[PDB]
Amino acid sequence: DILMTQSPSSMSVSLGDTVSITCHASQGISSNIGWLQQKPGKSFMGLIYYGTNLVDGVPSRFSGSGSGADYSLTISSLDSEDFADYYCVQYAQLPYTFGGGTKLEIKRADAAPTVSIFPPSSEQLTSGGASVVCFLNNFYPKDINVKWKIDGSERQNGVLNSWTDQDSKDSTYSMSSTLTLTKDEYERHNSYTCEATHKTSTSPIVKSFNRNEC
């Protein structure tokens, strides 16, 4: 089985830029390489076959290059349509094998998240459960770390995290984090906290509430 190592796994680039994705085979595959595009939520479109040949209809700005075991896809003058995922496939040997993928991402200024902590709703509590929610909203770059503390002790299990894709307007990201625990435990502690760590600040953004404080 030939291994296809694709680099980078993602890049932050702007409109008009000329970018290149590289793809390295575990052994020579004499130009028997295809490049594919997958736009957000959409299916696949073929860009290049046999190393350098564009599929019918694929715009001129895409080009394949390379030989032996090392190949490169170049997109020149990036269009806003070109912010997708890209994969190489080899067909020198069966089984056909794919690259890891490269994701083109919109570059923008760094932004710290707006953190909001929410205690369990009245409905949920009366039903028997207790979820504490935290929204870390509109931040860049995408990498972020959330941490929970119940009375200043780090809570590890029962956290559920979910990140959105890059916003279509302000190119930022957002993240929801939901700590769930038994109502029985929830009412045994006072201070609940969610701490956001991001590159935009060496010390974290801490949002808290004390249970029953109104």
């Binding site: 004499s30 028997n32 067909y91 020198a92 040997q93 069966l94």
Partner: peptide, 12 residues
Amino acid sequence: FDLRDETRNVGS
């Protein structure tokens, strides 16, 4: 015309 013989190692 191209009179060179060709080899392609593809699809095993």
